[PDB]
Amino acid sequence: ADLAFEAKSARDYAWYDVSSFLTYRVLRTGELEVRVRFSHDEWVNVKTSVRERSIPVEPSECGRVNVGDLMLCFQEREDQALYCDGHVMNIKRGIHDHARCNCVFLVRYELDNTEESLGLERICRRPE
Numbered sequence: 001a002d003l004a005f006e007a008k009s010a011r012d013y014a015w016y017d018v019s020s021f022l023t024y025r026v027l028r029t030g031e032l033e034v035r036v037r038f039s040h041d042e043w044v045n046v047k048t049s050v051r052e053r054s055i056p057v058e059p060s061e062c063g064r065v066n067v068g069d070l071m072l073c074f075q076e077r078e079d080q081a082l083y084c085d086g087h088v089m090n091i092k093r094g095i096h097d098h099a100r101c102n103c104v105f106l107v108r109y110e111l112d113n114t115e116e117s118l119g120l121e122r123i124c125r126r127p128e
């Protein structure tokens, strides 16, 4: 029930689970950064690059994912595999039960603006 966090690396713009927070600093420009240890230690901007951890979606609740939603998406390309922000553009709804969702979510990645068709098993929702 404790709050848990993910942080966005300024190295590759992808999100990583935070194990703990070590210290902080203020840049001369006024920006506040925290030093995080990941579940390697990095400085990350508090305002833009630390948030409550994204949440897996169970097959029985795939209806809660809607066009326009911000999702954390598993983006696998070549031998690179990053968790990146995307927005759901389109949903092809499938016939399925509680065991496995077969709906297809077309996502558009925020950073490079590319699109990919993903299953529920590669996307996580934001809290609230």
Ligand SMILES: [Zn+2]
Pocket: 059, 062, 063, 094, 096, 101, 102, 103, 120
């Ligand atoms: Zn579904």
